[PDB]
């Protein structure tokens, strides 16, 4: 449950059910939470896709999406404006606190491994 | 939780715990302020004044339009409209309404005006395309003099009706009519000249019934749509009848956002609302107005009996939209009360102060001192007779700036003061900023104002690049999806650019990956 997950940090789900919430841990990337009708979309931003990436880097990025990736179920995508992002979907009534922390952990792990490759 | 995710806070302000209401529906904007246990302040207020009418497209389908104007008049909201904007054929209607025609007069004209015949007749205004053989928007303007469309029935009609409406408004306001600038305009019109965008701008300041006019169209040139904009800033001396005629003659619908203007401001409140009339999931994560916001401001438009019917329907639909917007509200969340108060304009602050002076005393004192200091600065600038020289500024200017500096005791107040010093219409502050551009200065407020002025300069350049380089290629028919993606990314880079370097990177990415676009990109880069 999202409110309980937030309670871990002494936070509470704001009563003004706004469509987008942003969390900033002391270390690591900002976590963007977007409300889906029946769940949440967890996203971490990696900046606009740079021009001129070497093939090996392109491969590493695309390999994040392997069904057997260690970052599973996180996915690497680009938004409509060309911003590289890692995302995962939290589904109400299925993903408990441990499941949510696991998504957050994988999003962070992916972020740390990839940011250096995007000079 | 692992070490790295031990502490976490909301990166944007979020109310926590219970809130208390500091002010309840204060003044005309119904300002409500709620503050939470962590100091976060939520501002709730009515929608901003409906000052803009936007007519997306036109032509035969515009038969219903008179119903919208009748609805605005019925609700006493037509005088509140300050500007009229129309795309393609919508410019025809916008020009008539902007000139001051009454809803009744406009209905009569619209009903016995055959827009299909008038438009079809337009005897080949493709001479424009040919003359542009020897950016684009400026080339089009430079070729109009060697084109003669003044006698075309549609243009003659628009010129005559707009002139009659303007002269009638002037005549009903004798105090205005006798003012020299107005008398000059009237004399020029009586001699046969047509109403210009500049005439409308000057008269609208005197007569609420006359509105400023914006006409935008997309002109296909070499398979690429070019955005053509006519208004008081770009084409003050162009007759509105000719602009509406040209815009209506282009063969690629102008996106509504291209008709809604960008406004730099010292706070987050929307300055005004639009009533957008049109006929008939995107995913951007952004950094760490939307179509949905535009949708809230849009009303979809639906043989004498049919005209009456379609107009009746639109009048009913617009009337309901106008009632419903009164029930809507705008909401903003701030990290502190003072920042919420800084978001309020002077009139709003006064309204809140009249109900709950205990929460506004500090903000009212700050506002009064800032206004007095800004005046002192203006007096110093104008009284200096030149801001150049071996020595930087003078004692009077320094003194005014020192007073502003003392008010900048928080990052929020510094930012507000710097944005206030950047108001584009303040000729004197603008002379000060221009005079000190690129220089190190002692005043923290002036330094912040200079940095903001530079950021605004970059944003303006980025917007021009978007319109001249990106828009035409982005909306080119048949543009492969890969190029569209590249262009969308460039638009994102341009929206966020704060330095010439960031603009250059956007241009380089297009040159290196796009498969005349590349030419225009290299042109802007140097």
Author numbering:
A (entry chain A): 1 to 119
B (entry chain B): 55 to 188, 204 to 320, 349 to 377, 395 to 402, 413 to 426, 447 to 659, 673 to 683
Could you give the paper's own sentences about this structure?
The cytotoxin ExoU, a 74-kDa broad-specificity phospholipase A2 (PLA2) and lysophospholipase, is the effector protein of this system that is most closely linked to severe disease. Within the bacterium's cytosol, ExoU is bound by its chaperone SpcU, which is thought to facilitate interaction of ExoU with the type III secretion apparatus. Here we describe the 1.92 Å X-ray structure of full-length ExoU in complex with its cognate full-length chaperone SpcU. The ExoU–SpcU structure is the first structure of a full-length type III effector protein in complex with its full-length chaperone.
Although both proteins are full-length, approximately one-fourth of ExoU and one-eighth of SpcU remain disordered. SpcU provided sufficient stability to allow crystallization of ExoU, but the remaining relatively large disordered portion of the catalytic domain is consistent with ExoU being catalytically inactive in the complex with SpcU. Although deletion mapping and co-transfection experiments had previously defined three functional domains within ExoU, our structure shows that ExoU has four distinct domains defined by differences in structure and function. In contrast, our structure shows that SpcU interacts with three of the four domains of its cognate effector. The chaperone-binding domain (domain 1) of ExoU is comprised of peptides from two distinct and discontinuous regions of ExoU: the previously predicted N-terminal region (residues 55–101; α1, β1, β2, β3, and β4) that forms the most intimate interaction with SpcU and, unexpectedly, a second region (residues 472–502; β11, α16, α17, and α18) with no previously defined function. The structure of ExoU indicates that this domain starts at residue 102 but actually extends to residue 471. Some residues of ExoU previously shown to be essential for PLA2 activity and cytotoxicity, such as the predicted catalytic Ser 142, the “oxyanion hole” (Gly 111, Gly 112, Gly 113), and Gly 286 are spatially adjacent in the structure, thereby explaining the previously observed phenotypes. The structure also demonstrates that Lys 178, which is ubiquitinated in host cells, is solvent exposed and therefore accessible to host ubiquitin ligases. The helices of domain 3 form a left-handed spiral, whereas helices of domain 4 are a helical bundle that interacts with the chaperone-binding and PLA2 domains. SpcU in solution and in the crystal with ExoU forms a dimer, which is similar to dimers of other class IA/IB chaperones.
